[PDB]
């Protein structure tokens, strides 16, 4: 009695390029932006994608080397070959960049920057800062500071444009 | 724990619901396999990922 | 940053961030996103008398993390 | 003294070779050939300096 593995029912696998192969000139990056097991974009050809990982900001274009990036609460930008920019905001996750010309950005939450409200974000920062002052212990303060970092990133993200 | 298994139901279609499995090896065994894939031709499709 | 030193796991870090991000969303759109960050789970063992004994091994609410 | 910048240059090549072999084990062969190529090119400079040294030492 053998059971199928849950990945057998998924027909869109990841294509890796053999190390002993010729190079190709690619003008499109196939992006897959995903939230909570839901793709907002699927194998979408784009011009470039900008992501904010722990070390810093990465601008991924077609042909980017194989890399894994641990994202941080921050905006994410997608620029199409047409010349159109679409901006999301993510709270965390990972970004896998493949040398074959694909980028799978899986996030816990990915919301268009339009949906976010600066007035709500601003007043939340004031409340959390007050909460940090009343934070009982070290752990509580650390949790509160996590919220503030995200809030300030959201506030700064919207103030940018 | 040597492994953590998840046994669930996959909805193939409105009338087809199969039984599916996700096996998750603990950190020690996973990093050991991840180490062999990087160092060897075996697990080719995982060679670039492992490194 | 400083939460790792306190034993907080990465998964709990993400849950807090998601709740905060959903907090900033407009009140009109908050309903959709907030349904994805509302704890509704518990861990229970059937008691000897036939009741529910709640296991407190893992926190459920971001406040108690 | 020119050999100081040659021997060090060779060490630089091999130092990077080990790292490259570690982050791409299955490409060991091509990297080694390129490393030898770089060593020979640097050795050419070393011989040029050595030839001048011999000329000014035996003449």
UniProtKB/Swiss-Prot annotation, chain C:
> Which residues are listed as membrane-spanning?
none
Q: Which SUPFAM superfamilies match?
A: Epsilon subunit of mitochondrial F1F0-ATP synthase (SSF48690)
Q: What compartments host this protein? A: Mitochondrion; Mitochondrion inner membrane
Q: Has the keyword Translocase been applied to this entry?
A: no
> Which segments of the protein form a coiled coil according to its record?
none
Membrane topology listed for this record:
Peripheral membrane protein
Provide the Gene Ontology terms for cellular component.
Answer: mitochondrial inner membrane; proton-transporting ATP synthase complex
Molecular-function annotations in GO: proton-transporting ATP synthase activity, rotational mechanism
Record-annotated disulphide pairs: none
Q: Which UniProt keywords apply?
A: ATP synthesis, CF(1), Hydrogen ion transport, Ion transport, Membrane, Mitochondrion, Mitochondrion inner membrane, Transit peptide, Transport
Q: Name one Pfam family in it.
A: ATP-synt_Eps
Any idea what this protein is called?
Answer: ATP synthase subunit epsilon, mitochondrial
